[PDB]
Amino acid sequence: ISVRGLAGVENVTELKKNFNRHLHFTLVKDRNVATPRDYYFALAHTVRDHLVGRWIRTQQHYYEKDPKRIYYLSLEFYMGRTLQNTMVNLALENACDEATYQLGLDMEELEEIEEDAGLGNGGLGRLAACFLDSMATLGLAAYGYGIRYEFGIFNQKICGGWQMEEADDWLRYGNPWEKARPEFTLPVHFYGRVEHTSQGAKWVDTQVVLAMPYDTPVPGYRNNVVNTMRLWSAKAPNDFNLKDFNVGGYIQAVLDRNLAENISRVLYPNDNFFEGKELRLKQEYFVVAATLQDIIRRFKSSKFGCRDPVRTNFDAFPDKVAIQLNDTHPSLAIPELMRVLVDLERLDWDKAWEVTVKTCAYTNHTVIPEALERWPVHLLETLLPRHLQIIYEINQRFLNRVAAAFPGDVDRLRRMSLVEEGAVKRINMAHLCIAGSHAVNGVARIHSEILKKTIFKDFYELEPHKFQNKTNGITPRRWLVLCNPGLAEIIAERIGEEYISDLDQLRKLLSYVDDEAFIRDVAKVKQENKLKFAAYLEREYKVHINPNSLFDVQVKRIHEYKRQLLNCLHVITLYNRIKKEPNKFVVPRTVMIGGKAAPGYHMAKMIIKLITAIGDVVNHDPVVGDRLRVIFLENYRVSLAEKVIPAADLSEQISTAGTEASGTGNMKFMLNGALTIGTMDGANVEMAEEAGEENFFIFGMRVEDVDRLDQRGYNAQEYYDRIPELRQIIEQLSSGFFSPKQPDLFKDIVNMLMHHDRFKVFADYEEYVKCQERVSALYKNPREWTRMVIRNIATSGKFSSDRTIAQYAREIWGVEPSRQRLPAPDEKIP
Amino acid sequence: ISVRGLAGVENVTELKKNFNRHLHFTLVKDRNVATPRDYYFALAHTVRDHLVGRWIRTQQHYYEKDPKRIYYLSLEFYMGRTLQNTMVNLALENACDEATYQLGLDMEELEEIEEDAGLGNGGLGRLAACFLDSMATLGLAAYGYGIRYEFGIFNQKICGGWQMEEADDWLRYGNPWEKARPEFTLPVHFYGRVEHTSQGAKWVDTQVVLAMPYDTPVPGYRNNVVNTMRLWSAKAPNDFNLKDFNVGGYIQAVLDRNLAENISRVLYPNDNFFEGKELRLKQEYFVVAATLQDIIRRFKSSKFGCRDPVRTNFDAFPDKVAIQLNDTHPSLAIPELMRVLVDLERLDWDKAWEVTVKTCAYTNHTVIPEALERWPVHLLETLLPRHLQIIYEINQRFLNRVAAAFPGDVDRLRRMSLVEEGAVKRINMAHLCIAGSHAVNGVARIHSEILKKTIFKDFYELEPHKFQNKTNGITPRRWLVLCNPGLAEIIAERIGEEYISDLDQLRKLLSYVDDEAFIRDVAKVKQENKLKFAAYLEREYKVHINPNSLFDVQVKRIHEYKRQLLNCLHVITLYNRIKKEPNKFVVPRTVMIGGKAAPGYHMAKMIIKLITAIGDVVNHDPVVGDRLRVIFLENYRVSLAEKVIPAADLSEQISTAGTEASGTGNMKFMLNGALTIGTMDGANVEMAEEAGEENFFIFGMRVEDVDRLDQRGYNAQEYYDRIPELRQIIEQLSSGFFSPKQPDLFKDIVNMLMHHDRFKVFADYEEYVKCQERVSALYKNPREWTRMVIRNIATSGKFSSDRTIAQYAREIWGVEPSRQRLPAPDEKIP
């Protein structure tokens, strides 16, 4: 059937009875009233059963051996569905497929019922998920720590061409994967004030919110290792949240508990944008405060909570603990770690600081200013008074270090301050992370360099040793084996299976680049993938597409810097050219654009309306026929990504050079047999460098060109004046060609494009369509297109998160990865 | 060990492995980190396993045979713990005891970990629970329908002698008994307006709240029948509760979902008191609207949703459905049933009314005015506009019936109206229930008569056939076998086990009234029970009592009509007499008073402070010694009741004649070997009538005496003037003898007692202490005290809820009870 494992005689039989056990005893249903949803759950529970055994021994193991522990703090974990992934990592896919078949059910139909764990916005959240999978696969004693939002990223609905947001009640029917651990609930404080008494400061008169942990298992790939992802939930204490007496109402007191519990209610839907709301800050401290207590508790036990030097010496803390900050969201972990060490454990400042810096590491994910976290002091002042005092003290000492290194450099001092003066004083979380971490890293080579040359230049001059790079990657398991079993099979037919946990081995495929059979096969799976997607489209969304056309897709969050608008201009151009010479042949294309716009991002929501507007015109023009279709992919999410990417021919990664930190969707497309048209931005540079620029469609300004243009000054009018095709499009928008009933509907877009384009869309227009012509040319030559594909796929190895994690492990955490199978799952009950 | 069933070889082995299965796979724990709470859950899950098989066949059975269905609507279901009760009804107690013993655990210690299902205030809620157990035991196709509050009755804490309320988070660690059924979620409407168009009225522009059902199994006693208790939970729709666009904030929209979900958040803590809050009304319509849709759906399927006359003829509705209204809380079911039938199904008014009246039955639970539900019209007008129109129409037609029966009786007309004029117009829910039901019943003979003679006299004259009586009862399973296995064993040793489901058989114990062995045994278990309780007291609450003294206990909600105050006066009297003649012998007593006071009931909270105040003085007077102890039983609840009642010697049921509808605690004490001192009120009358007045300690005014006194006019001063002992107590309170630091602390109590005692406490004082002397006299003669006990126990049979339910079944529902064992639980998987 494929290499989804063995469909053993004994195990298929075993699976079936357990499926029935759960349908009866767990779901309390009988075959006569069970619905597909019930069947999905019976299975989920049956599969979940197979990894609890391993989960328990893994955790027990780490307790015995006591290795250095890795704590990945992130406010986002974009997990997606987990049924299939679990079957794959446990080599259960074929057995389950067989068993469910014998039970008369279609496993695939059941998998579609699982809701997505959308506790993330996009790239940042998904990276965290891929990392977790890789850390488990590499045998690291790692724990993912986050917030268990009851409402993840909103579900996107397109009404009249507009995006409509609606709550994502992913827990409505329950989550068979998590395990509530109410017995490990911890308290978290807010507000209050600071008392300075005799021997130390005291954080007093605080409001308490409880943090209840929920554990979700993270299985490594076929190595019997199952790590843990701990998500915190906010719960109100039953005392003060009722006990603070003297009139108000008993009923009201109980109803008001949903005020402390609102902390973990919903994820903020912003991608690459900072919103200074109190609720957000509360979420940030919540996950940090709770997690740290859990980290220290585990440390106090270790082998110190037995003997060792005997005396809670936190000197070995950094030798046993490593906490990675996914962006600045969990930045409060630094001043919080100090608070505990200094205020509670009573360590001297300097000893505490040394420990803190040695255990903390920060990862930066963007360079755009509006995404940078700068919290107003009055907020920190009210909500976390002691933390503010600690930050000021950290700042004081840090600046003193600077002054001593650059005597007289007074401007440098204000520039590096963690505190920003002005309208309102703010705290620059990024400066905080750099100062309190022993390593700061970028997510792509170019991005990392930009940090050193630009944004954090002063910091780099002060401590050049801190700065590193760790190019992002993706998991070959979910992003290849899971979503594209067809391609994975033919690859395995030639080079084996060892590449799933050693993607570098894909290079061996280079020697089949001229293989007639392979070329035919690679081309076959892609054709099958396009047919399956074209079907899914009519199934769930309804209104036909042509599977023979070039599948041109751009899927990622909607942003001005991602330039979906640039993609739009090309589409309209294609349309106009066809309308000019109707009977001229052109390579058919189905351009698919999908992504979510943050609710408050007006421009982004305007662009979505534009895309659908274009499709309304283009898709109903009889002269165009099936040569050009414009489709907006609704509710783009992980599960949807697993469907389009494998069916894509052309991957669009066209951000303005220097704005996309790295990108990961690009990597997903490269590994699944799609060719990339893009700019020298983020990881695109390393991808082309890996596959050879001849096998990539690069175009547009490089970073330097962008800067040159900024010195000069960007004037869009020039481009409007010198390019008729471009002018023609702008006037079409301006006159309502795409919005008849509302002629001025797109005035904001035009106005912006002509007068305030921060991302110079026009500057890359010419080189973009020219480049687009080159890909159409190559598509006309199937054999050569496929050979170029084989060059990309065979060379994507470097982009596996296993590589990235191995680097973090060695160069930052100080731990050695291991592909050693944990001693089976075997029963055991001590 | 006892008759808690057989500890079979095969089953104890089977139990143990399943216990382990759950500890591992369900709880995801290993023996090395498992805590008592974990062990309790492993067991709970293991036990729950044994009744899902029976649960499924029971429900399937009712689907095949299609009998008349009984729907018990109540806003309260005071369930308590359910582990032990389930073991008892399934004959699993000894096997589980053995198995857990072999696993090295103390079952009793684990049972104490289970949280109480406190979804009730007191008597009314507990009755519902006992009924459910009896309906299952009698093989009725009955369903308990209610609200799944996430916060039940508050947990009571005594701080400085005062009651402190704190949220009862009973779901904190989960509820292993319930089964969420999100797939059966129903919509419920609120607000909106009424459109009258061509063919009918339409309820429009309503706000929607979803109702999610949760099923809890209700096992009959050893008959393999497992009925269902369906509790609704409020859930917000994800559309409009987000989709009603045009600014407000996406985050705020999501946080605001906890506004529609507040409906099922908390139970109103009022007992015998009406609070006209909108939230309460919302809870009432919520449970009614959801339940009815479920009732009709089930009906539409029946055997009509196949063939029959073919044409949704609701003529057979009453032959297939019976809905019992537990008090007026679910009264909206009447106008709602009409709404559906008339508005949606399109039946003519008269046909709809005939059906409604024929399927609805109302049970009244109190006669005090402040407990009567009278909803302001402006509230119904805003929240349920169509229902108001229906009520007015029901009223119109009803009054027309009255006018026709009593021509010219204009005062009768305004008296019987469902609508009450005055300050604000109100709707008398009680009048509504009488008019729309085919039967109205009281809960005790005297209470039922009072309804006919007083409160509902006019209604009785109009339709004398509607009025009946159904004396309350309690379940012998939980209230005897479960809480007093010792007494149950010795009874079974002589007369067998058939009495557990046929309590009348207890009469056979009369012939052992002179049996020397029995007398010794009955006396022995009571001594063991008192020793166990005296221990529990020092264990969990700490501060000693004497197990040789008379256990004088009064446990029930705190009310002015229950007269805990009268009990207080006696206690102080005993104290004063001892202080007068220290070296005179008196029968030692431990008087225990416990109960919860509604948060807003100032007087009730004042009485609690008084009780503790008395104990502070009495319990620390060296001259008193161990002859007199005053203890306030904290957080009285079902689980606590199961501990005190079996250890009680004297049961206090001293309400003012005519105020306690029936009472059930009284019955609990009678069946557990305690003697009763009380007034001729509620079921007390029937109890003494059953055991013979010579075996009861009756005292005080009868109902007639109370009325005579009211004609005359009640003046407390008289009693104050003629009784020195009484005067002495009042002046002690007035001068701060019991409240040194705050001398005027009890001025409200004294003031009330002297000037506004609605329950004439003073009027029964003399006869009460005199009577109390008689019980002390009898306690001095162990042999005779025990013989009188045997007379009570042997004669309590009539007070089993099996008797009550059998009467409801035959005289109201039109169904025949059956003690037929359902065809085993045996596997089966069709």
Ligand SMILES: O=C1N[C@@]2(O[C@H](CO)[C@@H](O)[C@H](O)[C@H]2O)C(=O)N1O
């Ligand atoms: O704030 C960010 N930064 C992002 O991080 C991702 C993972 O590092 C990068 O691949 C992406 O290029 C960057 O924009 C991202 O997707 N979001 O939301």
Ligand SMILES: O=C1N[C@@]2(O[C@H](CO)[C@@H](O)[C@H](O)[C@H]2O)C(=O)N1O
């Ligand atoms: O409103 C009432 N009515 C009550 O109903 C119980 C069950 O019918 C009766 O036994 C009790 O006497 C009556 O007060 C009760 O306990 N509450 O709260």
Ligand SMILES: *Cc1c(COP(=O)(O)O)cnc(C)c1O
């Ligand atoms: C991988 C992924 C992303 C990131 O895409 P980029 O192209 O790097 O912005 C965002 N959303 C989903 C659902 C993804 O799977």
Ligand SMILES: *Cc1c(COP(=O)(O)O)cnc(C)c1O
């Ligand atoms: C039985 C019971 C009641 C009712 O007691 P009465 O004496 O009838 O008022 C109230 N609370 C609990 C916990 C009970 O078990």
